[PDB]
Write a protein that binds this DNA or RNA. Structure first.
Lengths: 70, 70
DNA sequence: TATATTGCGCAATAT
DNA sequence: TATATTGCGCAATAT
């Protein structure tokens, strides 16, 4: 339209749209950051699992003969 | 509204834009799905770490004054 | 003469 | 009389 109330409401909506779009950009960046954090924690936990496995293999490899006197 | 070539170019761009925006929506869904998958794998790995801890503590808890005949 | 992506406004809709 | 979100077109830009 062309009324003065129309122009002010449009100006305000354009402001809100810019704000909402900027907020969505920040959310998407936060989602990317979360993917990186979970990937790092996944690699930490998997290395921890493997570490425990390697320490148990060495614990069983050398164990071979637990004394059986009789 | 410059020419007939203008109208066809705009029609083709509107098609491309709708396609591009749909592709972005599917990409964002893929990122959400990835977050869920990493979250599930992180819970599986943390449970595995805790299981290995519990099986080690109970192993050494029954371990007591293991023979030292001197 | 091609499609793909993106900042912006609009209008409809949602809160 | 409020802002927030979203489908769509436009024009500029990128590939």
């Amino acid at each position: 339209k062309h009324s003065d109330e129309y122009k002010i409401r449009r100006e305000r909506n354009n402001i809100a749209v810019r704000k909402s779009r900027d907020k969505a950009k920040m959310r998407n960046l936060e989602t990317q950051h979360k993917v990186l954090e979970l990937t790092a924690e996944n690699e930490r936990l998997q290395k921890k699992v493997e570490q425990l496995s390697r320490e148990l293999s060495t614990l069983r490899n050398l164990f071979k003969q637990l004394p059986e006197p009789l």
